[PDB]
Structure 1
Amino acid sequence: MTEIALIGNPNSGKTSLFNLITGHNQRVGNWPGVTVERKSGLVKKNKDLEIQDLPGIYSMSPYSPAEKVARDYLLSQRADSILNVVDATNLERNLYLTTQLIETGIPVTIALNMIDVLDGQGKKINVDKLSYHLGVPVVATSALKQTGVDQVVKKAAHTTTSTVGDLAFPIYDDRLEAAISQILEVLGNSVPQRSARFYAIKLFEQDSLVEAELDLSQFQRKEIEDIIRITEEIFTEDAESIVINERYAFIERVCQMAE
């Protein structure tokens, strides 16, 4: 049983896609925050696949208990594939989460949703360019026009933890990359190896939730703190700001290639 998780911003069209894929009629509304819990269903054309609808999230640092549900499902390691639902009309803001999803180590497939709206706006995205520079498969989809839905499933089904080798992660400023390496060494086996890069960056961000979940040793905590301090001194900038700006810097470069 292959497990696909529907991840992406609220109001991006995850449930709309879920209903088409499974045959269900789950609640779909034109405002952020409709889905409030996990909903499972089998993929109709290939029953070996189980797909999970989940509440929308803006990032992997949640706010609502609804946002937590989606995060907790991914971090429990239950997902074999991340089907990242992306609103193409607001690509830059949507990809902020995407970078974090690749970092979790669960192979990401992008449903570049709402492509029909984008075609109305007269704008276009070079799908293959966006795919190359992001290191993930991308499929232009429309839940309204019912285009590209089967193809995005097919690609997600074939981009799993058991079909994909070495994963290409978003490469940031080399100075932060040096800091990430040092945190990875410090972490060791305290996290699953697949998700190590995700946790390492979150620990650099000094994310409250991740810090509490991990319960690191006094020696790990002390070294990570020294690494942050030094990197802050090097970047002439606070840790939280370094990452936020590095993600958007990475996204801006990618969107220039694609748009």
Structure 2
Amino acid sequence: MTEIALIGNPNSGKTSLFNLITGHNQRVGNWPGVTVERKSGLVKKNKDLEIQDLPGIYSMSPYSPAAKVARDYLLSQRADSILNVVDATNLERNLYLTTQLIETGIPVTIALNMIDVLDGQGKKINVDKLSYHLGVPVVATSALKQTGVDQVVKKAAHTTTLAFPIYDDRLEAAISQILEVLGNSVPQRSARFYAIKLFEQDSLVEAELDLSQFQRKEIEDIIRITEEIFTEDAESIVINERYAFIERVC
């Protein structure tokens, strides 16, 4: 069955969207941290789509066990579509997570939620330009006004029937080298995600993959060589490339 996962920052409106899509009445609150575990439901208008409400998350290197629930569901390879719920009033901050979601290889559809909040403040956001620069479908949504909901579910449903944010080519060289070291050690769909996290020296991914000493020695050498090329630490190279990619689109 087609699985759509609701991924987004805390308090961005994920459960609000879930309740409209499923007809459920899961807990919704005007403060972050209401949802703490996964909740499933059928799309009321297409009973062939199953959608998953998940706790808020800021980064695929999560800062909390609740957020790690959302990361673990994505990396369990059970989701066919990521419905990325983006707080339209906090575009830049939300898009940092969005870049990592795209790298997972699971097709991403953006629900630009709380668009009524932006409307009241007289602010505009060209969805077509944002979609063009991110490489994913984008739909302005409002769970309060109940606008755009059915539309974003259809496009998420159809991404399941991929262009990654391409960073500095010096970093892309290292990513390709780490990919060839990984081989089939990771699911092919999410190979780029694991390669980047390994470059970031992410502790979660390192503990999860359990690579051989032969693999780890080369990855370390790739990181060190690339760090010398950038004259910057590995973790900061990726963070700077994510934000630099965002500013070109925002």
Tell me the TM-score normalized by structure 2.
0.99
Number of matched pairs: 250
Counterparts of 1:134 and 1:67 in 2: how far apart (Å)? 23
Aligned to 2:194: 199
Q: Deviations over 1:102-148 (max 9, x none)?
A: 10000000000010000111111110110011000000000011000
Q: Within the alignment, does 1:252 sit opposite 2:247 as a pair?
A: yes
Counterparts of 1:71 and 1:227 in 2: how far apart (Å)? 26
Aligned to 2:102: 102
Identity among equivalent positions (%) equals: 100
- Unmatched 5+ residue regions in structure 2? none
Q: How far is the alpha carbon of 1:65 from its aligned partner?
A: 1.2
Q: How far is the alpha carbon of 1:22 from its aligned partner?
A: 0.2
Q: Deviations over 1:136-188 (max 9, x none)?
A: 00000000110000000011111116xxxxx1000000100000000000000
Q: Deviations over 1:184-229 (max 9, x none)?
A: 0000000000000000000000000100000111011000000000
Q: How far is the alpha carbon of 1:63 from its aligned partner?
A: 2.0
Q: How far is the alpha carbon of 1:25 from its aligned partner?
A: 0.5
Counterparts of 2:180 and 2:121 in 1: how far apart (Å)? 47
Q: Deviations over 1:233-256 (max 9, x none)?
A: 00010000000110000001011x
Counterparts of 1:31 and 1:60 in 2: how far apart (Å)? 21
Q: Secondary structure at the match of 2:184?
A: coil
Q: Secondary structure at the match of 1:189?
A: helix
Q: How far is the alpha carbon of 1:64 from its aligned partner?
A: 1.5
Counterparts of 1:160 and 1:82 in 2: how far apart (Å)? 10
Counterparts of 1:63 and 1:134 in 2: how far apart (Å)? 25
Counterparts of 2:2 and 2:177 in 1: how far apart (Å)? 34
Counterparts of 1:135 and 1:64 in 2: how far apart (Å)? 29
Aligned to 1:225: 220
Counterparts of 1:126 and 1:189 in 2: how far apart (Å)? 40
Q: Which runs of 4+ in 1 moved over 3 A?
A: none
Q: How far is the alpha carbon of 1:92 from its aligned partner?
A: 0.4
Counterparts of 1:179 and 1:99 in 2: how far apart (Å)? 18
Counterparts of 1:63 and 1:92 in 2: how far apart (Å)? 19
